[PDB]
């Protein structure tokens, strides 16, 4: 979870100031890295195999239970949401992922300069699009680069807090209510966990103990056959 | 509690210098993050489920007691107030959350420049609003940017200390008085806590001990059936 | 105690250069933060409840003693004075809390420039008041900003050391004399402390031991009722 | 795995701005260091010898099993892919390895300057090739150096995330499915590991114990033969 | 002792360049902080009360001895001198505490400029006094500010080493000679220390052991009276 | 091994820009430091003496074995190659050791300026030789100093990776194949190691135990002969 | 010993450029701090009292021995020389303590400028004396300030190494020869040390054990006399 | 050994640019510090006394042996060479100790400027000598200061590596050959070491045990004679 925030510093955002690629490159940085951390939430878990080994059979003779599986699945999905939830928020509290996503859509005749200063309806996208990357901006007449960053960098943080609110309100709601939390079905899941754990621990003990009783018959053939006597003796 | 103060440095405040959005964006940074830490105070607690499982039934056959619940609820709410209390204070001891909230309301004909220098009653909001963000300020004639920050940044810290005073005086008052602190009802709550704890500890012992007595009948079927003899023996 | 000094660095002093608000904003930073740490000295203590539970009854049937309470009260007040004592001193060894408190009162015709250079008796407050905040000072003729800071920043440190002297001389005096230090009454207080401590420790032992004898009758109802047999057995 | 990322900082990339060598020097930094970490993944493993000692005999009398080997091989290859997978991604999230690979191929008459400004079809490679190394660039007329880095540095990160997605989706797929994961064959592999380990541990015990029973007959010949008496005695 | 040196860095010396206040503000920083650390040396000690409780009675029936007290007193005073001794030296090895103490007294017609350049006998104090604070110095003609700091900053360090010499020579003298060091009286003091220590340790044992035998009769009244039965039993 | 890389930072490379000394000073920094670490690999080992003590006799009556020695020798040589292998690579990934080795050999009429601009065939070495040390370069006309460093600094890193590839491919090959790895001869070597170790440990025990039985007869002659009585007794 | 070197950084050398005071202030920094560390070497030792208590009596009835004292004295003096030896060397390896000691004595007509350029035989001291403190130097004609520092700063380090040589040669000589190192007298000194140590350890045991047998009769008078009963019992 | 390298940073080299003193001051920094560390290698050893006590007698009745001494001596000398060996090398890998040693000897008519530009055969030493200390160099015509440092700073490092090679080749040679390494004589030396060690350990035990049996008769005379009764009893 903590690695989700620090890796954002390693990434070096930069938006290609082009008309139709901004909307692609912006959202992609917003949604795809979440999707990675979602799937990555499963492979790090250990019970993922049991579901596939169990859910693979479309015959109904499944071993564990019809209801315990639904619980264990719905539980594992919850502990996965934490990683992508952190990413989508902390990236929304910066604006850079959003400042160049919709930069080619804001209104200029409302908060910026006048409605028109002598440019067609096509170059406006050609000119507004370069709002980020404050080193090549040919639209200082149409709107100030310093202001148009404030208007958008602000709107981002609104979605930032309004997102974190709707997220925590959801955790507070499922953490204290019905969604497959029943007392009976809970004991089954917690019990089958210990069965899986002491199995692996108890198996390793018997195997190693079986070898030690068997390897000794081999190590008495390398010995007593080299020379049966050391020549280096004085 | 300590994470409430350090996260303020991670956030990068910046106020959109517009007439009617300041008052929105200012207060929102003041109140919403508190509301997050309030709800977050519950989900981190563990007894939250017991209340919902208990308070859900609107029938009166509740198990624990009619009075113990009211205590445990009123206790949990107290340990939640600490987080949002720290946020609302330390953010009030900076002014940035408040300097742009009411910047479009102070009087200019009292501490600033003269009463009027040739501007209508509409642009004053248009001009005063940009007092923060000291890079685009077209009102150096109407009031100095250096002074108008002092007048407001000062008034903030007054509410800062005056808030922390009324807060600590409240803690000192409830920490040594009546609010459901009775000796009898207290023992019930402290007793039902240990019942919940040694339950989980004592349950895990019996389950694991039950598996170990049962798994051994399975591990004697993988063994003694592979070959009953190692071929690698010399 | 140590947090009293370090928090001073977190606070960012700045004095609103106005005529009648300096005297308010100055002293407030001097006295109010002390008052916070005073009350905060009680809520962190644990015996505060016993006094309120005991001193509440205005009937005279108080349990502990008529004299032991007076000792325990007068003792707790002493260990509270340490925090505000550190604050009022270390803030007096800087002048910033005092340089703008009385900056509108010093004499100019004594150490500064000439007695009068052509200004009325009203603007002198209007002009002298801005002595701190060395970026907008319209009184370079009436007195040098570099000198008038020395005269006041010096007078502060006089009260600084003269305060710490009168403080330590008071600690040295009460630490080795009469103020309710009698041998008899002392043993009562030290004895009732251990009674309060081993009570809480001894109570938790019996309660937890009572549950463990009782929870076992419940955990034999979830078991032996699931199936009495594992289906996953080979 | 972690050393794969940090060593990238030690390496100091720099692309020789020549026409036909870019495409060589670029890909080489992309593919060769992966190939090193692949082979290096084997030599650090310990079971590599057993395969060669076993797979060397092309006669079919192999000792372990016909199926266990295929598992152990296919398992070892998996834990090797992690190192080169990290390299090829983190180097694709920078562009420098890719910005000079294809810099001599992008279109100029699409996103850059005009289609032609008076240069033949040969020097374009001669001029475009020096796009990186922003100190000797004789093509400021044909396309801006600041823009042409954005267009390519962006396209890299697309392959960056699109690579990491297809990678993690592959791990999630093989981590929960068929590829030689059968229960029977698994026990063989895990069992032959312990045999190899307790062998080395049990052999060292017997050898050292055999010497200690034998060395003592030698150390009684250096002693009792020096003088049988110390001369330094008083 | 070590805190005496480091606190000097926290203090921010600055000398008010006035005629008759230098001599006051200079010595005060030299002597007063010593006097604080002297008295502070007592309150941190623990035997201070015994002297006051003993020396208070002006009747001669004192308990301990007529001679042991004189030893214990003369011993405690010695371990106090270490703190102020460090302060007065390390502050003398800087000159700032002394450079502005006597700056208005040095001779100008000896090492500085000529004897007289056209100023009365009053302004010389008015002009020489501002020698420190090298930002407002109207006496560059009468003596160079760079030289007059060397002459005084040097004389300080002479008293610095000459002080530390006379100090260590005093410690070496009393550390190996007569001043109430007799063998007989020494054993009394060292013996009465252990009596005071094992007293407090042995008292706490009996009191706590007495409560535990008594509290149990109270904790059997909260129990067995709540309900004698848990309702939450299944 | 790790000290091989860090010591490179301590060394301060600098190439004497002369015609025929570059080729000497360059290669010397490349090959000689390797040769040091090779020989240093032996003296740090401990079995080096046994070979010399054994291989010295050119008579054939050698004690250990005719075959075990060849193994132990060929093993020790392998663990020595690691140090010089790291040096020759990491120094090839910088170019400075190679940029001035062959700087007087590259072609100028291929990638640099024109074929000839008015200089004989002798001064070209006189002029090209100073390509490194970019402070005295009299050949800005014949070829740019910025480009000619790229051409050579690049060619180095080609040999860098191409070297590390051929190295790791060699380790992977000998780590899993024939070169005196036979099972029989291996047990001899591993067995004679323990003999050497427990010998030194077992010898030190007997010697120290022999002295302690003998020193006691000496320490009863200094005692009981001083005076047989202390005079300081009271 | 190590504190002798680090304290040199704390001291801030600066030489008063005057004719006859240099020679004083220079040597004083060289010799006096040594003399401090010499005497300080004794007071930190513990056997210093025994000598004074023993050597005080000029009667010849001394207790320990006529010869053992001479050894213990000559031993303690040796372990004191280490501190001042380090100071006098490391301060000689800088020149600042010596560059201004003899700066008014070097020859100018030998390594500096010409023999005479128009100044009397008195001002030469007046002018040469200010050679250090390279901010006010009125002798740039008579000799360069940059050179005359080299000539003297060099001569210092000659005495630096030549001192450390004669010092270590002395330690090597006394560390392996006659100066009261005899075997007989050595055992006396080493024996009387243990007598002094186990005395203090054995005395503290008996005294504390004597109090504990005695304090108990006092603690049974504060108890059983308060009330013999707690009133707080329920 | 490691302190030999770090102390080089503490020393601040600087060469007095004079004709005949360079050759002195240069070599002195090269050879003398080695000679210090050589002698210092002995005094830190402990067996140095035994040799002097033994080798002092020129009579032939020496106690240990005629051959063991020669071994122990030749062994101790070896472990001393390590310190000065490190110094002479790491100082040769910088040139500063050598750049000003022979700076007044290199040829100018070979690698520098022309053979003669109008100066006699005497001033050449007068002018070449100041080659280091690149702030006063009056020979920019005769040879460039930047080049003449390269020519000499290079030649140093040749002797640097060529020295370390001949050194390590010597260690590798004596570490595996004849120089008094015989098996018989080795056991004597290793045996007499343990005799010396357990002697000191066993002596301290008997002496301390003898005092404890004797001090008790003294501590029963200070006790039972003070008063035989405490007066402070209640
Ligand atoms: C300071 C530290 C810095 C941190 C870094 C931060 C940045 C991080 C950025 C990114 C992180 C990305 C992580 C990737 C996923 C990791 C797991 C994995 O890969 O395992 C899989 C790999 O084995 C396979 O099955 C893949 C095989 C596909 C072939 C790929 C060709 C590679 C050669 C190149 C030729 C290219 C030519 C084409 C050119 C386009 C499966 O093996 P496993 O054993 O089952 O894995 C267990 C996984 N577990 C451990 C998670 C449980
Ligand atoms: C902060 C730290 C910095 C990190 C550094 C980061 C940078 C890293 C960069 C690069 C890392 C490169 C690592 C190399 C591989 C290492 C392993 C190895 O080499 O072992 C082999 C070496 O022994 C041989 O078999 C090779 C012999 C070939 C002769 C080479 C001539 C050398 C002389 C020069 C003349 C040249 C003249 C020609 C000039 C062109 C085999 O021995 P082993 O005992 O079986 O090895 C076990 C290996 N194990 C330990 C892995 C299990
Ligand atoms: C942060 C830390 C910095 C790291 C530093 C990095 C830089 C490192 C740079 C370089 C490292 C170089 C290391 C050198 C080799 C070390 C080992 C050695 O020397 O031992 C030998 C020395 O004893 C001898 O046998 C040599 C005697 C030759 C005489 C030399 C004259 C010296 C006086 C000067 C007059 C000159 C006059 C002429 C002027 C030209 C043998 O003794 P040993 O007991 O058998 O040794 C065991 C060795 N072992 C411990 C390895 C097992």
Numbering used by the authors:
A (entry chain H), B (entry chain G), C (entry chain F), D (entry chain A), E (entry chain E), F (entry chain B), ...: 27 to 260
Question: Which sentences did the original study use to describe this structure?
Answer:
Calcium homeostasis modulator 1 (CALHM1) is a voltage-dependent channel involved in neuromodulation and gustatory signaling. CALHM1 is the recently identified member of a large-pore channel that permeates ions, including Ca2+, Na+, K+, and Cl−, and small molecules, such as ATP, in a voltage-dependent manner.
Our single-particle cryoEM resulted in the octameric chCALHM1Δct and hCALHM1Δct structures, resolved at the overall resolutions of 3.36 and 3.76 Å, respectively. The overall protomer organization is similar between chCALHM1Δct and hCALHM1Δct (RMSD = 1.016 Å over 186 Cα positions), illustrating the structural conservation despite differences in amino acid sequences (72% identity and 90.6% similarity within CALHM1Δct). The structures of chCALHM1Δct and hCALHM1Δct are most similar within the TMD regions (RMSD = 0.826 Å; over 140 Cα positions), whereas that of CTH is more variable (RMSD = 1.294 Å; over 49 Cα positions). In our hCALHM1Δct structure, the cryo-EM density was resolved up to Pro85 but not Pro86. However, our chCALHM1Δct map allowed the modeling of residues 85-90 and revealed that these residues are located outside the center pore, indicating that Pro86 is likely not directly involved in the alteration of channel functions. In fact, many of the subunit interface residues at TMD2, TMD4, and CTH are conserved among human, mouse, chicken, killifish, and zebrafish orthologues (*). It is worth mentioning that we observed octameric and nonameric assembly as assessed by the ‘top’ views of 2D classification in both chCALHM1Δct and hCALHM1Δct; however, we could only 3D reconstruct the octameric channel as the majority of the particles belong to the octameric species. Inspection of the hCALHM1Δct and chCALHM1Δct structures reveals a hydrophobic pocket ~15 Å in length (parallel to the TMDs) and 10 Å wide, located between TMD3 and TMD4 of one subunit and TMD2 of the neighboring subunit. In both hCALHM1Δct and chCALHM1Δct, we observe phospholipid-like density nestled into this pocket, which appears to fortify the local architecture by interacting with the hydrophobic residues in the pocket.
